[PDB]
Amino acid sequence: GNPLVYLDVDANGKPLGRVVLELKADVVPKTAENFRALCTGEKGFGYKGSTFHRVIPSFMCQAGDFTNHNGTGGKSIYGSRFPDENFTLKHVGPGVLSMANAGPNTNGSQFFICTIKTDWLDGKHVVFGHVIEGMDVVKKIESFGSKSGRTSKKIVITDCGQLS
């Protein structure tokens, strides 16, 4: 079946808990595989130790820039960037897992978890999974955001990997 992966998240060095994500490999195998491998760190790099650097309440929590930690960086397991696989899955509501980008065909490692339905992102960002468990943790992360996206606490993925 589809991979189940996890992110364990701290805020200012205290654990918030675990976000569990289903990766929809049946719809977007290439995008799912990238995220899976970045969680396990099996290629020698990935999400462990990186941050949620941009969080906007009533919108989304963004993470995955493990090179620059500011939204300019990251890399995929294939190379620096890879194409938009498809736009079949939609930004249907809270819990949607989707690829951040800098325009068409610029997927790297950066990703976001929606806290609302973000329909205007349909056809522009590749949706590749959803939150199975831990929306409470996502809501905590969301609460440390701001209109600008600047976080009021340091939000760190302390551990991550694959459950199945």
CB of 162 to Na ion, least distance (A): 9
Q: Which of 45, 57, 40, 52 is nearest to 10 (CA)?
A: 52
| Tokens coding 129 | 């999974």
CB atoms within 10 A of CB 27: 17
Residue in 59, 81, 87, 162 annotated catalytic: 59
DSSP secondary-structure letter at 114?
Answer: E
Binding mask 6-25 for ligand N3M (x = CB under 6 A): --------------------
Among 58, 103, 147, 148, binds ligand N3M (CB under 6 A): 103
Residue in 54, 89, 91, 130 annotated catalytic: 54
- Which strands sit side by side in the sheet containing 60-63, from one edge to the other? 52-56, 60-63, 111-114, 96-99, 127-133, 14-23, 4-11, 155-162
DSSP lists the bridge partners of residue 61 as 55, 113
Among 25, 38, 60, 156, binds ligand N3M (CB under 6 A): 60
Among 2, 40, 101, 162, binds ligand N3M (CB under 6 A): 101
DSSP secondary-structure letter at 121?
Answer: G
Which residues does the annotation mark as catalytic? 54, 59, 62, 101, 112, 121, 125
Which residues of the chain form contacts with ligand N3M (CB under 6 A)? Answer: 60, 62, 71-72, 74, 92-96, 100-104, 106-108, 110, 112, 121, 124-125, 130-131
